[PDB]
Amino acid sequence: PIPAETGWDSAPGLLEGAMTLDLTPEQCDLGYWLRGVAQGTLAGRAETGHTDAEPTPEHMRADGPLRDAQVLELSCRSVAEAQATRVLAHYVAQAPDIVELEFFTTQLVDEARHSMVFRRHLLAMGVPADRLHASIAEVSAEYRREVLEPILDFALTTVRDEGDFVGGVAVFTIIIEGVLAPAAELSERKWNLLDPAAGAIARGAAIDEVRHLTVGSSVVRRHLLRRPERKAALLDIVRRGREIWDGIPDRKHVLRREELFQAGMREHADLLAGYEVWPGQPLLSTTPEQRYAMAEQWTDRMAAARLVHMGLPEAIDLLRLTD
Numbered sequence: 001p002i003p004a005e006t007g008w009d010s011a012p013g014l015l016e017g018a019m020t021l022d023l024t025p026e027q028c029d030l031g032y033w034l035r036g037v038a039q040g041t042l043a044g045r046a047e048t049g050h051t052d053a054e055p056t057p058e059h060m061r062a063d064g065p066l067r068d069a070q071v072l073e074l075s076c077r078s079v080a081e082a083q084a085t086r087v088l089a090h091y092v093a094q095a096p097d098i099v100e101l102e103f104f105t106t107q108l109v110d111e112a113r114h115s116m117v118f119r120r121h122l123l124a125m126g127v128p129a130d131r132l133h134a135s136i137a138e139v140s141a142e143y144r145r146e147v148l149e150p151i152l153d154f155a156l157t158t159v160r161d162e163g164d165f166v167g168g169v170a171v172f173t174i175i176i177e178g179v180l181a182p183a184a185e186l187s188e189r190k191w192n193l194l195d196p197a198a199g200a201i202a203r204g205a206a207i208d209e210v211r212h213l214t215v216g217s218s219v220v221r222r223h224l225l226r227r228p229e230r231k232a233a234l235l236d237i238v239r240r241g242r243e244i245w246d247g248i249p250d251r252k253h254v255l256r257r258e259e260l261f262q263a264g265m266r267e268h269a270d271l272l273a274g275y276e277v278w279p280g281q282p283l284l285s286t287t288p289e290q291r292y293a294m295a296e297q298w299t300d301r302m303a304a305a306r307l308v309h310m311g312l313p314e315a316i317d318l319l320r321l322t323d
């Protein structure tokens with residue numbers, strides 16, 4: 001009996017699961033993760049995230065804008081997930097008790113796995129093994145400096161330097177993953193047909209992320225119930241997260257890879273045809289600006305549900321993106 005929310009076929013989508021499920025760290029202990037994720041979600045997918053029935057097509061190995069789009073995105077994601085692993089190590093170190101120790105251990109290994117399958121897809125796309133880590137660093141350097149390091153510094157300052165465990169979980173789950181998971185859902189929808197291996201990689205990570213998002217919400221929710229006087233402190237953390245994001249040139253980087261993806265779609269439009277990136281919307285008929293704005297809309301929709309569940313509805317207006 002593998003749980004329904006971890007099953008490769010039975011698991012909800014990312015936004016769907018994060019907005020509807022209630023998972024607690026108590027429920028998602030290490031035994032749950034070993035049986036349900038390592039032996040469940042990842043059965044037959046341990047080394048690369050995907051099976052042989054889900055190829056890296058030759059058009060993803062051939063030089064061109066579609067490959068350039070995936071190389072840019074997965075170089076950035078692989079670095080982001082590796083740095084997140086290092087930051088999450090402090091959440092394990094300072095976990096208040098065994099229940100959080102176990103859950104954030106599982107999330108730490110999840111993020112390290114995400115980093116691994118993203119970098120291994122770069123190899124499957126013909127990045128030379130002896131150039132892998134240096135090309136990853138070259139391609140992602142501007143993104144790491146301008147986007148990744150500011151938000152992970154915020155999490156690190158909050159958990160390590162200030163010793164605020166639930167404050168740091170609020171940072172990681174509201175300001176980081178809450179903000180970035182909708183682009184991950186969009187990534188899976190964009191790539192499912194053009195790069196089946198990458199679609200399947202994204203799918204497994206999204207199932208993990210349902211758990212990360214719902215459990216992080218539970219941690220914040222339970223803290224706020226036990227210590228209602230801490231609401232003000234949580235809201236100021238959220239306010240500072242918004243200010244940090246406002247100084248980050250996120251749109252510039254997203255549109256860079258969406259313009260590459262757009263030129264790549266042009267070369268494989270026969271394959272896409274009527275494929276819909278979301279209901280009633282063929283992927284071919286979207287622009288970079290339109291996919292960016294839809295990811296922001298998804299961010300707002302998920303944030304309204306999650307912040308309500310956490311008891312921080314006052315944070316919704318602070319974080320609203322669609323203006």
Ligand SMILES: [Fe+3]
Pocket residue numbers: 081110111114205209
């Ligand atoms: Fe991840």
Ligand SMILES: [Fe+3]
Pocket residue numbers: 111177208209212
């Ligand atoms: Fe995650």
